[PDB]
Design a protein around this ligand. Structure first.
Ligand SMILES: O[C@@H]1[C@@H](O)[C@H](O[C@@H]2CO[C@@H](O[C@@H]3CO[C@@H](O)[C@H](O)[C@H]3O)[C@H](O)[C@H]2O)OC[C@H]1O
Length: 188
């Protein structure tokens, strides 16, 4: 399937890419999706909710085997203000917080997370080309299955001045940046 959003087997999904090639996104039954990629471009895909909420407890399980630059995250957006956010549970060779401004720490679901804010300028977004902040929680202890109590992150962020607008979609996402890998993830 081509990039798009919609509902599949009861779950919202979003699949986006930069058009390069080298990535196959597949919707499985229930909350399952797979991503297989090799010599990809930049892409983000996964399943979840539209809209997300600020208290959702998100469960994910399966396999995540990146070869290079990739993230596995609870991923979503707010509007008014436009914010792209991540709770990064695992990643490949590149830490997305590299060179980023650290805004605190939070402990949640069995690990410490480091909190960051970054800036995107004239980049793709859920409202088209836009300039926006990104908020990050990066898990210290990598894992490919677990539960994320999102409120712990949103609250810690807010305490540190990283506040959100109205919630748009909220998914468990596999993101890749010009790399290879595989993932098979079930969301609930
Ligand atoms: O049809 C439009 C969609 O194409 C559009 O999709 C979003 C475009 O921006 C994506 O965000 C990037 C994902 O990768 C990150 O590293 C970057 O920081 C982001 O720029 C987002 O994932 C897509 O959902 O949404 C609007 C539609 O009109």
């Amino acid at each position: 399937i081509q990039p798009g959003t919609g509902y599949n087997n009861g779950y919202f999904y979003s699949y986006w890419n930069d058009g390069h090639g080298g990535v196959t996104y597949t919707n499985g039954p229930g909350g399952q999706f797979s991503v297989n990629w090799s010599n990809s471009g930049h892409f983000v895909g996964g399943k979840g909710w539209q809209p997300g909420t600020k208290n959702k407890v998100i469960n994910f399980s399966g396999s995540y085997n990146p070869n290079g630059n990739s993230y596995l995250s609870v991923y979503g957006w707010s509007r008014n203000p436009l914010i792209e956010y991540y709770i990064v549970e695992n990643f490949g060779t590149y830490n997305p917080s590299t060179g980023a401004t650290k805004l605190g720490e939070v402990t949640s679901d069995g690990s410490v997370y480091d909190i960051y804010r970054t800036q995107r300028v004239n980049q793709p977004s859920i409202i088209g080309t836009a300039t926006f902040y990104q908020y990050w929680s990066v898990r210290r202890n990598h894992r490919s299955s677990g539960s994320v109590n999102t409120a712990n992150h949103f609250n810690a962020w807010a305490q540190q001045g990283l506040t959100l607008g109205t919630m748009d979609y909220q998914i468990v996402a596999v993101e890749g940046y010009f790399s290879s890998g595989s993932a098979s993830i079930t969301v609930s």
